[PDB]
Amino acid sequence: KKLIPILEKIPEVELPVKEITFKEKLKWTGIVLVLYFIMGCIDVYTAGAQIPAIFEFWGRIGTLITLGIGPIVTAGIIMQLLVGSGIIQMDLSIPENRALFQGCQKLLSIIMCFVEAVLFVGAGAFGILTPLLAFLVIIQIAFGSIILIYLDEIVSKYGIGSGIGLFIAAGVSQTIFVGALGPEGYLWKFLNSLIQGVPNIEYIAPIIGTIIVFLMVVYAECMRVEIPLAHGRIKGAVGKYPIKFVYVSNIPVILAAALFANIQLWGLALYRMGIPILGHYEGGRAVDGIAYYLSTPYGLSSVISDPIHAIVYMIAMIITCVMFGIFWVETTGLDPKSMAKRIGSLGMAIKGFRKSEKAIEHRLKRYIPPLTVMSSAFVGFLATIANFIGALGGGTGVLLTVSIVYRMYEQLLREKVSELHPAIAKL
Structure with a gap:
């Protein structure tokens, strides 16, 4: 029921x-x-x-x-x-x-x-x-x-693609084009600052921060885990299948940063409406309590003036990521059960060995978790670091966006093609 x-x-x-x-x-x-x-x-x-x-x-x-x-x-x-x-x-x-x-x-x-x-x-x-x-x-x-x-x-x-993913990518991207070039745009605030004759590095600062993040975020987004494949009945070296080492823990990290989102909100909410269970905010955000120790430091410039705060956050984020990652395993995620015959039909057992269902089904159910964990742990780290550096739109968001956007390019491609052979909608 x-x-x-x-x-x-x-x-x-x-x-x-x-x-x-x-x-x-x-x-x-x-x-x-x-x-x-x-x-x-x-x-x-x-x-x-x-x-x-x-x-x-x-x-x-x-x-x-x-x-x-x-x-x-x-x-x-x-x-x-x-x-x-x-x-x-x-x-x-x-x-x-x-x-x-x-x-x-x-x-x-x-x-x-x-x-x-x-x-x-x-x-x-x-x-x-x-x-x-x-x-x-x-x-x-x-x-x-x-x-x-x-x-x-x-x-x-x-x-x-997807609504959410879009909406996210949509948001961040807007936030950039406007933040940097819009009305009260930053590139102007700087160029003007230059004309005025009082070169303000703080007006071009955030714009750089982003560039760096993007450059960074992309690099990582390229890394992949290539898994060599056994010939489809044929003979000799064949496949080399790659997995998006980073996009694995996408939805995951979205959930982590999301959690800290509902904390800062639930702390300030359950602050000016009750007892300071999570933390003492004041001034808008939190300046003490769990909330404080779990508040992303980005925005414009990296705050060194609190080493401990940093470490905690990073570690805090890292572990939260691993978590939703694993909780992405017990649920939906990459399920070997399916991967079983999908890879069996072509009869393409890994490069190591074992051209059997239960066989590859196993080597898969095994390799998975370490991957899922590794990935996330990394991402979350990256993201967090991408926030220390701080960039327009949101270090972390800029990350999601880069992925989302690319997974969206892929999507546009798998489509440009399925728009020919009305059948292979599973290959």
Whole structure:
């Protein structure tokens, strides 16, 4: 038995078995992309056209998407947590557990949709807690986030890549082009600073920071784990199959940084609305407590003035990553069961040896975890370091973006081709 009733009440998206042309999947995505950007341009209805100049610069918040992917990720965090620590053991295999784990997470996503909404205004994100206007706001806020949930479904079944991934990449990229070249653009603030005759290195600083990060992030994104393959019945050296050593722990790291997101928010929220359980904020963010020790130091320049803070964070992040990584294993992730015959059909057993199902199925179920762990541990490290360096858009985000974007290029390719041989939609 399960929460199937209300779960069956929750809307979904009609997936056509019809012809969805490349040109269409594209044009569709495009429509989503914009409605997004557009929402980010529109402010939430609130007489208090004031969000303390304090949170004003705080990424988003004040727009129709003040919550953004925030809830969606939170939810995913919980599930990975339960269905992760065995707390609620489930063997997805059957379409039951699969659609159960999913359908369920979705619902929670909406729960969290509102919870976060309230949690945001309750954290004093706007300033004027007019019980009436406060309610009104919450509405719009969490309802916009909802449109994303659905706009995601759309892309996820009518376009390319993914909503979330897009939205993320979309965000970061905008944040850059605007931050550096927009109205109050930074490249200008610097060039002008140069004309004014008082060369301000702090105006070009962040722009560099990014470049470096990008250059860096990409390098790592290139590394791969090549696994030589046994001839498909033939004879001699053949395959060399590569795996995206970094993109393995993508969704994972998104979940880690996401967790620290719900802490700083839940700390300040459960601060100016109760007891300082997590930490003493003051001044907007946290200056003490768990919250403090778990706050990313980036923005403009790297803060050396707190060595300990750094170390903790890094280690803190690292371990959180390994975690969701593993919790990405017990669940969905790379499942050898399938990898079994998929690799068997071609009859391409690894380069080592064993051209059998249970055979490769095993060498696979083995190699996996160390990989999954290694990868993440690294990523999370990188990301964290990419934050010390600090870059426009968000060191970490810039990372996700680079991956997301490239995995998106790949997607565009696998598509340009499947747009010829109407069959090989599994090779």
